[PDB]
Design a protein around this ligand. Sequence first.
Ligand SMILES: [Cl-]
Ligand SMILES: [Cl-]
Lengths: 55, 55, 56, 55, 49, 57, 53
Amino acid sequence: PEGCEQVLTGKRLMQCLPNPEDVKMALEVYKLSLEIEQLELQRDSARQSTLDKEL
Amino acid sequence: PEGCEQVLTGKRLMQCLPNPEDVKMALEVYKLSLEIEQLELQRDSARQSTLDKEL
Amino acid sequence: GWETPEGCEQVLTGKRLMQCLPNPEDVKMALEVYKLSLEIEQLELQRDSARQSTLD
Amino acid sequence: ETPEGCEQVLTGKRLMQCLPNPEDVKMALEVYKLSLEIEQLELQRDSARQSTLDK
Amino acid sequence: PEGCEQVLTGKRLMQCLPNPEDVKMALEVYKLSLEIEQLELQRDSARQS
Amino acid sequence: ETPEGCEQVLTGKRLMQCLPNPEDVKMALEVYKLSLEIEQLELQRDSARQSTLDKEL
Amino acid sequence: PEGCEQVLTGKRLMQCLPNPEDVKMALEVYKLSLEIEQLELQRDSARQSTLDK
Ligand SMILES: [Cl-]
Ligand SMILES: [Cl-]
């Protein structure tokens, strides 16, 4: 049908792996990894504030 | 009733596939893929700046 | 002997929405799906308007 | 007893009594919240298809 | 150990009620209530504005 | 036998040892996080019931 | 597809530990810890506002 193009695209992605359920987890994990890296950067780039701002 | 238009729209989307439960997953997967891509861009466009910063 | 206590208007509203369908659990999914669809569309726009912007 | 620092918890607990089944309370709220968020998204969508017509 | 301070704090909160699982729900519900109120304000302040 | 790129994972794993049952660790954090988020929300709410007041009175 | 590269990357991460399900939890926990720290800072840097006036 029409309107379902988004769904089909997602469905196609679910075939990147044998268990489509594994696809979602893989992405969730990768996404976590990326978000964490940004968080680590913010944390460091703020301690680099306080450390210098102890100065 | 009336006020249920949003619900109906969602319900219609759930018919893009035989198993409506698959529809939600398909969308979640696609959404993950998009979000990840943006995260990758931000990551690259930041590693591209730490570099510039020291030249 | 039930009387709904005070400060529950939000709850009632949600409850009313749960009657848009025979099965209330189906209501939440329907909305979640629609919401996903909308968010995705926005994401697609941002993606296109970024492959385009800077393109010239 | 009930320790101090649990005021937030008690408030939530009180809300869970708006209905016979407390698990229904959380769902009711989640649904209403979804409805509100969707409405906002619909507005943004329209007010963007309109930027793209009105000029 | 150390670094576990956050965990301990959360653990302490889980003792606000006999069933710790009820604590998380209570908070989730309260949070929902607050978020909704904000959403309602934004909605009204847009139908107005 | 851990590869490289797994540093984030190891860190999380170490946190999971703050308590005997590891599943309890995640809940404890989720609860604490909720508490903090809520406090911020309450502040925003108060600082808006206050601000509109300053603007409109 | 530029689709499967993302998946592969995630899949590789799932091998940081013997049980891949543990990987996701470890990350979720770490992420929580980071978010909480930020929240604590915001809270303090706002109570430090409700001091000066
Ligand atoms: Cl409230
Ligand atoms: Cl993609």
